[PDB]
Amino acid sequence: RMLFQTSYTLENNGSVICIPNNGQCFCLAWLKSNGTNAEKLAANILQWITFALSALCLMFYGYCGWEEIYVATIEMIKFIIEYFHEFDEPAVIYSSNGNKTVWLRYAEWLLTCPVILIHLSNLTGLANDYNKRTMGLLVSDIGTIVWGTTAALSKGYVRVIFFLMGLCYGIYTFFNAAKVYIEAYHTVPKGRCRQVVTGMAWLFFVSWGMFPILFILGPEGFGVLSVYGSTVGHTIIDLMSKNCWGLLGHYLRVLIHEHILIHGDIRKTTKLNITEIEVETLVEDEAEAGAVSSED
Amino acid sequence: RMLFQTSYTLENNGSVICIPNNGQCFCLAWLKSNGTNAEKLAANILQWITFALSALCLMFYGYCGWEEIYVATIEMIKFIIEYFHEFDEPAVIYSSNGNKTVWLRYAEWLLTCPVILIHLSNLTGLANDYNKRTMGLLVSDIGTIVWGTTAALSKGYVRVIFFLMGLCYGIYTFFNAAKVYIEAYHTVPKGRCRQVVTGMAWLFFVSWGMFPILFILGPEGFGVLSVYGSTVGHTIIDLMSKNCWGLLGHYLRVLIHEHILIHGDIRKTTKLNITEIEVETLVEDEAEAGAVSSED
Ligand SMILES: *[C@@H]1O[C@H](CO)[C@@H](O[C@@H]2O[C@H](CO)[C@@H](O)[C@H](O)[C@H]2NC(C)=O)[C@H](O)[C@H]1NC(C)=O
Ligand SMILES: *[C@@H]1O[C@H](CO)[C@@H](O[C@@H]2O[C@H](CO)[C@@H](O)[C@H](O)[C@H]2NC(C)=O)[C@H](O)[C@H]1NC(C)=O
Ligand SMILES: CCCCCCCC/C=C/CCCCCCCC(=O)OC[C@H](O)CO
Ligand SMILES: CCCCCCCC/C=C/CCCCCCCC(=O)OC[C@H](O)CO
Ligand SMILES: *C/C=C(C)/C=C/C=C(C)/C=C/C1=C(C)CCCC1(C)C
Ligand SMILES: *C/C=C(C)/C=C/C=C(C)/C=C/C1=C(C)CCCC1(C)C
């Protein structure tokens, strides 16, 4: 298939490589297999599943709400490019140091992850403003992706350093994401809405926590997983991080909207001691408009 | 210098290239010159100037205010990498399609540009919140950089399409940036503060507008400019977009702070008809707390 040189001869007892002078770049490292047919087959099935589910999610959202639509749109464009050019440059970058870097994946993260975090910063959909903490979440997450991409493009100690820089940015992201989910839990009404927020937190930390594990295991790290193997793992946590998380987030916004139509927007101030934070909780009746504090 | 193959022999009347089987990648396209010694010399001088000015800006900011510090820090790290590894992968990506892509530049844009726009969304430094429009500015600017980077990595019609996708994201960014500067102008006190905001708008639109022009002229476009030539142009608009803009922005925040200490925080509602928008203007005396409308 390749649009780099794939035909060569070994000469002088394997010490010389001769290639056609046809303008193409050449490197042995680029011709290593991407994995077994079973790994490839598994990857093509999960991709169709993700494309189908993203199209179902899109039509379903088509009946504010813009973050779920933007991510599902990017996911669709991603699949059409994978289907036609998955291993064509620059969906995969084949670089002079011999690396294969899945630019398609990192570009998708730069497009979708900040939007997931904007959604996280307004889980109820009622806020018209965003605090200073939202800005730190976005700046830390962009840095994480930039350091991780740089680590994947590098080798040796340069890779290790940029990976560690990504991990420090990532920890700052996780820490601040955790505070938002804690605020969200004490903001939404007392019943089912707190089940969904709890569900979204589990999906978020498990799926986002898997990305650094898949990096270390993949060709970008210790080469335990092949390229197809890494694709299979990444589409699974894509389904959790994007499709399932967005579905719950959409459901949560529907429940908040139904609550406000039936009961109106009645708030109670709750205080969170763990640091001193203030949150305006939604309640069901006017017997609550007080100043409560919940110790963690 | 290179850590790709630079030694080869032409055989069979220039129709065959033979190289050592030493594990290195090889491509003729990678060995094209980066430019003249004069272009290189010009580029090394402007880089020292930018590193020195970024260090002066850092010490000066060292006497909220975090956006100027974050950008000046990234600029410093950028210079230490340029000084030691400017043309080493992956500061430059040498890819299988023959392209040289200055990943160092695009990674810096992903780190600094969103932070410049967060600063723009709070020019006075008094806001504790950010509106919905801030989020569209950040999401549009990230997309611009992602499409532009993808265009630089591509060739032929693929490059043209991703460039046009960047231009559409970019126009949305410029349009929304223009509204913010219009709001900022009618928000800050009537004298010198409105001169600085006007100055920051000119710096912003001229320096940001030059990036797509330098893309079209550089190796990523029609190859009018060489690599050193493109570096020289980019450090100039870096000085305008980052160093000079941040300096004015810091100065503006100092003037707003002095105004509020001497006069207190007294606001007047002004309305902007061009769409109907509301802005809380800072004034000097209590004879103003009314509802004015300024027709554009
Ligand atoms: C050609 O190079 C090959 C390298 O594979 C040489 O073959 C090996 O020679 C070494 C001796 O240093 C043995 O230890 C290996 O068992 C050999 N075979 C293999 C498969 O590695 C070979 O000797 C060289 N021929 C000449 C004429 O120099
Ligand atoms: C070797 O290839 C070269 C290609 O440069 C041939 O040289 C040219 O031959 C063409 C004829 O098709 C002329 O139009 C050019 O003027 C020649 N010189 C140059 C500098 O381009 C050469 O003929 C080939 N030799 C053999 C034995 O096939
Ligand atoms: C907060 C999220 C929770 C999850 C946290 C997960 C922790 C994983 C840490 C591993 C550090 C080990 C260093 C990893 C460096 C990877 C780079 C690499 O593989 O280097 C290649 C090597 O130089 C040649 O084979
Ligand atoms: C809003 C900001 C104001 C400034 C706006 C600036 C307008 C520049 C537009 C040019 C379009 C022309 C198409 C550009 C495509 C570039 C890709 C290219 O050079 O293609 C290489 C070619 O395929 C092989 O040589
Ligand atoms: C839809 C795709 C998602 C949510 C992707 C998320 C990606 C990350 C959270 C990446 C995390 C990384 C680290 C924490 C450090 C090492 C480098 C990364 C980029 C793999
Ligand atoms: C400090 C560096 C700055 C402010 C860089 C800004 C970069 C841009 C505004 C890039 C703009 C582009 C377009 C509008 C479309 C084509 C692709 C880009 C990325 C060159």
Author numbering:
A (entry chain A), B (entry chain A): 49 to 111, 118 to 328, 331 to 352
What does the publication say?
Channelrhodopsins (ChRs) are light-gated cation channels first identified as sensory photoreceptors in green algae. ChRs consist of seven transmembrane helices and a retinal chromophore covalently attached to a conserved lysine residue via a Schiff base linkage.
C1C2 yielded high-density microcrystals that diffracted XFEL to about 2.3 Å at SACLA. A water accessible cavity is illustrated, with the putative ion pathway indicated by an arrow. The five glutamic acid residues lining the ion pore (E1–5) and the two counterion residues (Ci1 and Ci2) are indicated by sticks, and the three constriction sites, the inner, central, and outer gates, are enclosed in boxes. The intracellular end of TM3 shapes the ‘inner-gate’, in which His173 forms ionic interactions with Arg307 in TM7 and Glu121 and Glu122 in TM2. The inner gate formed by Glu121, Glu122, His173, and Arg307 prevents water influx in the initial dark-adapted state. The crystal packing of C1C2 shows minimal packing interactions, as compared to the CrChR2 crystal packing.
